[PDB]
């Protein structure tokens, strides 16, 4: 089906992740010591802020850190953590 997304599965599997569930296009849970919620972002494919915020919220609900799996137009995969910050008062204020 989708060779770019497939590159993500292959990559994670190569380092001992198990794929637990696919929730949607682009969204899946996988595990290696802790479960993470993955969101695949293909180069050139824009998503709305609302979509991103929703995925981030899903993570909070499910109690799982969110990882964006970035995929280049020809299959290179790079991972970023993302979270919604709750910025505390500065201690050194």
């Amino acid at each position: 089906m989708d060779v770019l997304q497939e590159q993500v599965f292959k990559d994670l599997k190569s380092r001992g992740f198990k794929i637990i569930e696919q929730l949607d296009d682009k969204i899946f849970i996988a595990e290696k010591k802790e479960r993470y919620l993955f969101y695949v972002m293909v180069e050139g494919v824009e998503v709305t802020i609302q979509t991103l915020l929703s995925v981030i919220n899903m993570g909070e609900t499910l109690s799982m850190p969110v990882v964006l799996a970035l995929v280049s137009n020809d299959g290179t995969v790079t991972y970023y953590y993302v979270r919604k910050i709750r910025l505390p008062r500065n201690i050194y204020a």
Binding site: L12, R15, F17, K32, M41, V42, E43, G44, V45, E46, V47, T48, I49, L52, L53, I56, V67, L68, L70, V71, S72, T78, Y79, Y80, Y81, V82, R83, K84, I85, L87, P88, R89, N90, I91, Y92, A93
Partner: protein, 183 residues
Amino acid sequence: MIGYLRGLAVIVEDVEFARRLYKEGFYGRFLGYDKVKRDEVEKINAPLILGLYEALYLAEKGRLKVMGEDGREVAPEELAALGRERMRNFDEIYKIYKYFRDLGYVVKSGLKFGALFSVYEKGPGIDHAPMVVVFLEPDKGISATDITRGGRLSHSVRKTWTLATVLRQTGEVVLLGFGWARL
């Protein structure tokens, strides 16, 4: 408590006031110094320049009275109208500025970093070492390339950076933190 509006910045000519602003929030920059430390402030006698967001914030708080070129007081709402006229997204950006400042963070220009703001706990120098804050404008989506770009702007080995936006529906300021994941 006076500063003068001259274009898109405000200049404080009362050096004793200038010093108080800088030692009490690291507001502004002295010409032509930089990375001024608090303890070298007293031996500085130069004017202080405040950016429009800084000046507006201080006016709101009211730690500054801004005087225009015709000798009028320029009220907060006047400052904001000027910003809105000249700077795209001023209102949203100011909200972000104020968000960080109200929580006790030092907010400075992000230009040097290619970003909206640089945000500090203690002060630029010294030490430690800015959080790079990138703006997400209205109506704009996000893609993978935005994320790696932020990572590049980062000065951390972890490639950590923050995305700031204001949600149109609610006006909520929303900050997202990103960092490289070596999975």
